[PDB]
Design a protein that fits this description.
The structure is cut from a larger assembly and holds 2 copies of chain A and 1 copy of chain B (about 1300 residues).
Chain A lengths: L12 H8 L4 H9 L4 H11 L1
Chain B lengths: L5 E2 L6 H7 L25 H4 L8 H5 L2 E10 L2 H4 L4 H5 L7 H6 L3 E3 L17 E3 H8 L3 E5 L12 E3 L15 E5 L3 E5 L1 E5 L11 E2 L4 E3 L4 E2 L4 E6 L4 E5 L9 H11 L2 H13 L3 H19 L8 E7 L7 E3 L5 E3 L1 H22 L3 H19 L20 H5 L6 H4 L8 E8 L7 E5 H7 L1 H10 L6 H8 L7 H10 L5 E5 L8 E9 L4 E3 L15 E5 L4 H10 L20 H10 L19 H10 L14 H5 L1 E2 L2 H9 L9 E4 L4 E4 L1 H13 L4 H5 L9 H14 L3 H21 L13 H21 L5 H29 L5 H7 L6 H8 L27 H36 L15 E4 L1 E2 L8 E2 L2 H8 L8 E2 L4 E2 L7 H13 L4 E4 L13 H4 L15 H14 L3 H8 L15 E6 L5 E6 L4 E6 L12 E2 L12 H7 L2 H18 L6 H11 L2 E4 L10 E3 H14 L8 E4 ...
Parallel strand pairs in B: 18-22, 19-21, 24-25
Antiparallel strand pairs in B: 1-40, 2-15, 3-4, 5-8, 6-7, 7-8, 9-14, 10-13, 11-12, 13-14, 16-17, 18-23, 20-21, 20-23, 25-26, 27-32, 28-29, 30-31, 33-34, 33-36, 34-35, 37-38, 37-39
The complex binds magnesium ion and zinc ion (ZN).
The site of magnesium ion has 3 residues of chain B, from loops.
Chain B binds 3 DNA and RNA strands through α32.
GO molecular function, one term (chain B): DNA binding
Keywords (chain B): DNA-directed RNA polymerase, Magnesium, Metal-binding, Nucleotidyltransferase, Transcription, Transferase, Zinc
Enzyme class (chain B): transferase
Chain lengths: ~50, ~1300, ~100
DNA sequence: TATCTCCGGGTGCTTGTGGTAGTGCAC
RNA sequence: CCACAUCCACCU
DNA sequence: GTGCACTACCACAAGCACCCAGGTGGATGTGGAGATA
């Protein structure tokens, strides 16, 4: 919000569209790596650096 | 290290609760205001949940507490659920007995009931506290006696009703009155004198025949207690024997302590097998619960909870807001209240025992526990007075439209994402999108940091981050590095309403200057995105695995055709269509001279001279050829286009051009379009043969062209052709100059007199009403018919005028092509918008004579505002209804994934090719669109040869095959096509490749591992928002229509009797006759004496699916459901394939209930496939021929979705409470099959890339493979 | 309406104070307290649904916001989720709405 | 005496209850 | 710190 | 062997819990009486 813009919604309709394709790893990282898994997101940030 | 495979949910024992928690909380003190540190052992204690200072604080996120209640309590879920699980395990009424026992002052008693109170032996009756408190201690009465007055009754006088104990004292019932000086004690007891030692002491309760005292001289006679008074040396025995006394949840516990499941199960079986279905219904209803406890382990003894768990503090934190004030979740308030009440109860029980106060406090504590567990089920506890907002309990956190399930199933927040307004991207290619450079730099920040660390921009990553934190340090080298980073990366663009699969699309970002996102025009229809201010979101996948996924199977260049049907979505849009129509149009003006040209060879010079003068125009309508074709002949298309560039001939001019092999009398515009197609693709012969250069390029022509190019060329060539078409359409629409003025809305003059004629007819009808010849309904129908006929006549006249006089009119040109507008809109602009619907649903009698070319009267505009408001409200609500339907379908169908070896299905469906009833009795060929939607992309069940061509069994039906079959059916060879269908597939969870079909975004057969269920649900639900719909709802959710049509269940003949009270239709057979009563409104469709079959609709109207299934069978009702669902979608012009509807219908009736029991109960319904496996195991695999005779049960979409083996999806779908309760009664080991469960757990999706068929695929290059194979063959010695 | 609600609250308060109070020469202070009525007025002017933020984008915006009529209100009169029957215009709206 | 702390609209479901016909006791 | 409630808008 | 009342079963009425599209931006709001310091 005031500090940073904040993340964009991914809802369920977007999830339904994403898994309607064969994309499974994209959904896996966008539900855990880029959304919630704190150790996962920290490790991913360090690895990308 | 081991992978998660199953998720089990069950009840938790008090031992489990104590094992979870680390200590107990006793103080209701959250946190002191002055000392920000935790106050005491309460809800935030330091040593009970872990260190608050940086193990990290995450331990406090997971450590749980517990509260040891001094009084047992029962979970509100197991007592207030609609099937009361405690109330159905025991023989207690759910609604009133259970709660009056569980809250109020009522007593249930198992052990002793032989005592008599006017009622025979008591076993488990519910009796009020008053009558039990009486029969506990006999029948006691007390009478004070005034001092100084001696009553006439002594200490041992038996007293009956009416006896005067004194000059003013009289009793009321039989008993014994003991006298004192100073009172009278009336007891219902028997007194026995004795003079020897006592055998039974004071306090013991005795049974008849037992020795009381004095040896065998004195013995007990009735149940009761013995009291010995040595003042008169007498033993009194009351008629109240030792009987238990229990109240509250603790009492319930005792019941659950003494209940054994095996004996109850055997008794239920015995008392269910014998009687009729009336009792056996509830018998099996409770027997299933008993078996659920028995087979699942956990006993119901701990079904009520003794120790209440306490959530970790960070899950219910208290946060400073401003100026020291604390914002806290309602969880802390509920926990504080429960702790305070439990402490008060402990203190009260410790100090003293005032029974009524103790009981009130017990009720209060029970209510507090229930309110904590779930708020609203009994009363409405609220926050501090002044804010009437009910407290949020655990159930509110779990359930609701905004609950834990609907915030973790969705991943509501993403790191690498942004959003911005979208603008048109005409210079972009179809596989590209324009990304603003600032948001692109921000989104790719870690990649940019790594890239500039690779070079010498910054020493370390901290320096790079502080360089990029302030925009005044931006440099051209940073932009070059950013461009280098995103050379191969792709980003996912998304529109806020994601109706179907194409709402997410991958693109190759191109750095642009500005704030908006540049979007390719051709994807303006895949998304429902115009450029009137709407915004779109962008996401950046990180892993190379996800990058490959997005670039391969989500790139916009690879998705050109719909998943709902074969119609392309990357078709040329409005402006491109307009430009291509303008360039490929032929104009004709007038013929002024003798058109005869075929015969005279000297006429060429004469007509050339005539064209030199004004005798004949260049595009003259001659007999054989125009003078334009004679005057100009071009050796090559290049010469013709060069002559056009010199202004000699326009692109809309008829002319003879020598093409590669023939002389064509065409226009240079058509030749240029053909050349555009031929250069967009490589070869020119194929391009020439896949176009039709004899007609204007309407939108249907462009769609067919795109489909043919995709079929015969592939992916890249189709995309290049689309790009070329878009570019040239833009250029020629710009140079052609299409403009709309007020004079372009030409009003035909003939329509004028048309109105007059109608007006005259109107007047006639008016006088026809004043003579009494017509009724109000008849007059209204006549007026409506007249106006709706003259409206169509005016539309026809308008279009005829446009064709005849102004072929190049912008409105007419846009209407003919697929650019914009409809004939109704063009009529409203130029003709008249006559009929306007009333808010009541009918139509106004007075039409609107004027149009928008003219000026509407105030009344006409006020009338049209009605329709405007109706449309707005209808959109704003039907969108919500369609969304709910889509969610239902997705959740019910989400488990269908094509995982398969080709199933040995010797079954199929015969798709009809003729409409069975368009007139009362007639057969005609179905429409081409319906046949294509029913046959295209299917697999032939068996070989069929129809027109000298052998269509082999197992061959996918392409579009050409569908056309051939339609032509053959027109010729009259075949009427039904036997094809495979998902409805007959034998796959466990999903459908096989053959039984599914051939239609996809591509044309090739479906790949194994694709989640066809979700795309099917999306395809069905997407048109609903742009749509009737209640009919779709009542078909998908199997219901009983209000206008039910009577159907017959057995073959016979029809006997109609026209009794005025109610028509009687008789189905007459050889051995019996059935009778049906049809009211006056029952407008039937059968004739007397006609043969009638089972399931044939006797009357016209909707057919209830359940009775149809009972009558004909599963296949017939499946076909009826599919056809009825397709009917409404066809009526709205939506082209939707039948594969998705068949998937949903198969998932709708995948349940059967058995009639002849095997190893389970009879009247229970579950999966058809499980019963098939059980039958195969019972009959063949194992010994014992026990036929499990079942019948298929058809249930709605909601019921099918709710009743599933996996409890995670059911809990997350509709109702967490009931589903979780059912999955808690019996330990439900949720196998992680289905996509919703894996989304919940966040693991790899079983569909798509995660399918075990393709999940692991070892990849090695040539040299490593050669080395390891050399190792292999050297292991094979010699 | 909000003022008379506050006045009724003040009337209940003064009745209770008189019931508790013994003597009589206490009219100024020991009878009426400004807290209930002032609190009611402030609540109405701050947290009510019809008392809403002014839209001063331009003079026309402010004027239109000043002359808007709402079917909604406190909540017991009209509510969001189901209002389909009353959303349509009426034949009497001519010249008035 | 001051500050702190207590004082709906629609659908599926279940249940019920008089109605209604099979069956038990009297003509 | 961002919790929740209320209101006004924008895109379907 | 039939006339009469009886009791288990069925259609109808009533009470009740549960549903009610997705996304974004902005704005303002979150205590009064008793009891003890
Ligand atoms: Mg828009
Ligand atoms: Zn199959």
């Amino acid at each position: 919000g005031k500090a940073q813009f904040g993340g964009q919604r991914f809802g369920e309709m977007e999830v339904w569209a994403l898994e309607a394709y064969g994309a499974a790893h994209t959904l896996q990282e966008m539900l855990t790596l880029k959304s919630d898994d704190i150790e996962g997101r920290n490790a991913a940030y360090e690895a990308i650096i | 290290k081991k992978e998660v495979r199953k998720v089990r949910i069950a009840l938790a024992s008090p031992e489990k609760i104590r094992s979870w928690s680390y200590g107990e909380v006793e103080k209701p003190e959250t946190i002191n205001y002055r000392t920000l540190k935790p106050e005491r052992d309460g809800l935030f204690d330091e040593r009970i949940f872990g260190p608050i200072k940086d193990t990290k604080s995450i331990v406090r996120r997971y450590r749980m507490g517990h509260i040891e209640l001094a009084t047992p309590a029962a979970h509100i879920w197991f007592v207030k659920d609609v099937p009361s699980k405690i109330g159905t395990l025991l023989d207690l009424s759910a609604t009133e007995l259970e709660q009056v026992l569980y809250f109020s002052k009522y007593i249930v008693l198992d052990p002793k009931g032989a005592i008599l109170n006017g009622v025979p032996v008591e076993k488990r009756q519910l009796l009020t506290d008053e009558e039990y408190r009486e029969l506990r201690y006999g029948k006691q009465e007390t009478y004070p006696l005034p001092p100084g007055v001696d009553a006439l009754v002594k200490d041992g006088e038996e007293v009956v009703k009416g006896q005067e104990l004194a000059p003013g004292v009289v009793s009321r019932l039989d008993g014994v009155a003991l006298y004192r000086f100073a009172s009278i004690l009336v007891v219902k007891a028997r007194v026995y004198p004795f003079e020897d030692d006592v055998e039974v002491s004071t306090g013991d309760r005795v049974a008849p025949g037992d020795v009381l005292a004095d040896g065998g001289k004195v013995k007990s006679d009735v149940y009761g207690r013995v009291e010995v008074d040595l003042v008169r040396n007498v033993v009194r025995v009351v008629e109240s024997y030792d009987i238990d006394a229990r109240m509250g949840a603790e009492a319930i516990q005792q019941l659950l302590k003494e209940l054994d499941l095996e004996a109850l199960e055997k008794e239920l079986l015995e008392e269910m097998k014998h009687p009729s279905r009336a009792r056996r219904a509830k018998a099996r209803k409770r027997l299933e619960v008993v078996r659920a406890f028995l087979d699942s382990g956990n006993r119901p003894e701990w079904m009520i909870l003794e120790a209440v768990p306490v959530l970790p503090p960070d899950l219910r934190p208290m946060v400073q807001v401003d100026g020291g004030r604390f914002a806290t979740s309602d969880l802390n308030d509920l926990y504080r209240r429960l702790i305070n009440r439990n402490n008060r109860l402990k203190k009260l029980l410790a100090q003293g025992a005032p029974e009524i106060i103790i009981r009130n406090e017990k009720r209060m504590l029970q209510e507090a526990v229930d309110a904590l567990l779930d708020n609203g089920r009994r009363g409405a506890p609220v926050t501090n007075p002044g804010s009437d907002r009910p407290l949020r309990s655990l159930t509110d956190i779990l359930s609701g439209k905004q609950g834990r399930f609907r915030q973790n199933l969705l991943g509501k927040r993403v790191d690498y994402s942004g959003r911005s307004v979208i603008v048109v991207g005409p210079q972009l290619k179809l596989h590209q999108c324009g990304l603003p450079k600032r948001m692109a730099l921000e989104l790719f920040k870690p990649f940019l940091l790594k890239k500039m660390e690779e070079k010498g921009i910054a020493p370390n990553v901290k320096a790079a981050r502080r360089m990029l934190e302030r925009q005044r340090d931006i440099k051209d080298e940073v932009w070059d590095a950013l461009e280098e980073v995103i050379h191969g990366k792709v980003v996912l663009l998304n529109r806020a309403p994601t109706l179907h699969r194409l709402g997410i699309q991958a693109f190759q970002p191109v750095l642009v200057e500005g704030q908006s996102i540049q979007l390719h025009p051709l994807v303006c229809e895949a998304f429902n995105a115009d450029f009137d201010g709407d915004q779109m979101a962008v996401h950046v996948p990180l892993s190379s695995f996800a990058q490959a996924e997005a670039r391969i199977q989500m790139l916009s260049a690879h998705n050109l055709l719909s998943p709902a049907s074969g119609e392309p979505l990357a078709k040329p849009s409005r402006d491109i269509i307009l430009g291509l129509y303008y360039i490929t149009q032929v104009r004709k003006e007038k013929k002024g001279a003798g058109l005869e040209f075929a015969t005279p060879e000297e006429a060429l010079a004469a007509h050339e001279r005539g064209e030199v003068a004004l005798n004949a125009p260049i595009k003259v309508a001659g007999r054989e050829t125009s003078v334009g074709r004679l005057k100009y002949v071009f050796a090559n298309p290049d010469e013709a286009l060069l002559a056009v560039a010199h202004g000699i001939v326009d692109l809309q001019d008829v002319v003879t051009v020598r093409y590669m092999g023939k002389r064509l009398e065409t226009s240079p515009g058509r030749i240029l379009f053909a050349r555009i197609v031929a250069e967009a693709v490589e070869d020119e012969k194929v391009a020439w043969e896949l176009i039709q250069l004899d007609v204007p390029q309407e939108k249907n022509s462009l769609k067919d062209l795109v489909y043919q190019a995709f079929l015969r060329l592939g992916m890249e060539k189709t995309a290049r052709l689309l790009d070329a078409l878009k570019y040239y359409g833009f250029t020629f629409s710009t140079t052609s100059g299409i403009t709309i003025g007020i004079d372009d809305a030409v009003i035909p003059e003939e329509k004028k007199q048309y109105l007059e004629e109608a007006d005259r007819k109107l007047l006639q009808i008016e006088q026809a009403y004043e003579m009494g010849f017509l009724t109000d309904r008849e007059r209204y129908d006549q007026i409506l018919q007249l106006w709706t006929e003259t409206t169509e006549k005016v539309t026809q006249a308008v279009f005829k005028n446009f064709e005849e006089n102004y072929p190049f009119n912008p409105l007419y040109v846009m209407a003919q092509s697929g650019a914009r507008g409809n004939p109704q809109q063009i009529r409203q602009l130029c003709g008249l918008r006559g009929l306007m619907q009333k808010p009541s649903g009918e139509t106004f009698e007075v039409p609107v004579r004027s149009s928008f070319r003219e000026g509407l009267t105030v009344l006409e505009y006020f009338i049209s505002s009605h329709g405007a408001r109706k449309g707005g409200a209808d959109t704003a609500l039907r969108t919500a209804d369609s969304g709910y339907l889509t969610r239902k379908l997705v959740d019910v169908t989400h488990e269908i994934v094509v995982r398969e070896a080709d199933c040995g299905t010797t079954n199929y469906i015969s798709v009809p090719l003729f409409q069975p009833d368009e007139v009362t009795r007639s057969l005609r060929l179905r429409k081409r669109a319906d046949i294509e939607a029913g046959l295209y992309g299917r697999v032939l069940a068996r070989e069929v040869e129809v027109l000298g061509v052998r269509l082999e069994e197992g061959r996918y039906l392409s579009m050409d095959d569908v056309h051939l079959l339609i032509k053959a059916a027109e010729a009259g060879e075949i009427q039904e096509v036997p094809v495979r269908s998902p409805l007959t597939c034998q796959t466990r969870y999903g459908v096989c490749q053959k039984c599914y079909g051939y239609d996809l975004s591509m044309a090739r057969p479906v790949s194994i591992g694709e989640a066809v269920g979700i795309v099917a649900a999306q395809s069905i639900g997407e048109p609903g928002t742009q749509l009737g719909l209640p009919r779709v709802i009542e078909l998908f959710e199997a219901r009983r229509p209000k206008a039910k049509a009577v159907i017959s269940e057995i073959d016979g003949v029809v006997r109609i009797e026209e009794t005025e009270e109610k028509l009687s239709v008789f189905v007459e057979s050889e051995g019996f006759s059935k009778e049906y009563k049809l009211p006056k409104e029952a407008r039937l469709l059968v004739k007397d004496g006609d043969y009638v079959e089972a399931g044939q609709p006797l009357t016209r109207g909707a057919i209830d699916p359940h009775q149809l299934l009972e009558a004909k069978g599963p296949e017939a009702v499946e076909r009826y459901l599919v056809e009825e669902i397709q009917k409404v979608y066809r009526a709205q012009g939506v082209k939707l394939h039948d594969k998705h509807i068949e998937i949903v219908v198969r998932q709708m009736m995948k349940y059967v209930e058995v009639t002849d029991p095997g190893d389970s109960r009879l009247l229970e319904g579950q999966v058809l496939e499980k019963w098939d496996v059980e039958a195969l195991n019972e009959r063949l695999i194992a010994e014992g021929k026990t036929p499990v005779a079942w019948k298929p049960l058809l249930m709605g979409v909601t019921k099918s979705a709710l009743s599933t083996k996996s409890w995670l999806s059911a809990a997350s779908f509709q109702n967490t409470t009931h589903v979780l309760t059912e999955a808690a009664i019996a330990g439900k080991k949720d196998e992680l099959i289905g996509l919703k469960e894996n989304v919940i757990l966040g693991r790899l999706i079983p569909a798509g890339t995660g399918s075990d068929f393709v999940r692991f695929t070892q990849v090695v290059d040539q040299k490593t493979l050669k080395a390891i194979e050399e190792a292999r063959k050297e292991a094979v010695e010699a | 309406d909000q003022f008379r609600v506050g006045l009724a609250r003040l009337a209940r308060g003064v009745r209770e104070r008189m019931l508790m109070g013994s003597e009589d020469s206490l009219t100024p202070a020991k009878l009426v307290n400004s807290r209930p009525l002032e609190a009611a007025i402030r609540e109405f002017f701050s947290r009510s649904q019809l008392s809403q933020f002014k839209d001063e984008t331009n003079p026309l915006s402010s004027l239109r916001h000043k002359r808007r009529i709402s079917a909604l209100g406190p909540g017991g009169l009209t509510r969001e989720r189901a209002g389909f029957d009353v959303r349509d215009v009426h034949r009497t709206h001519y010249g008035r709405i």
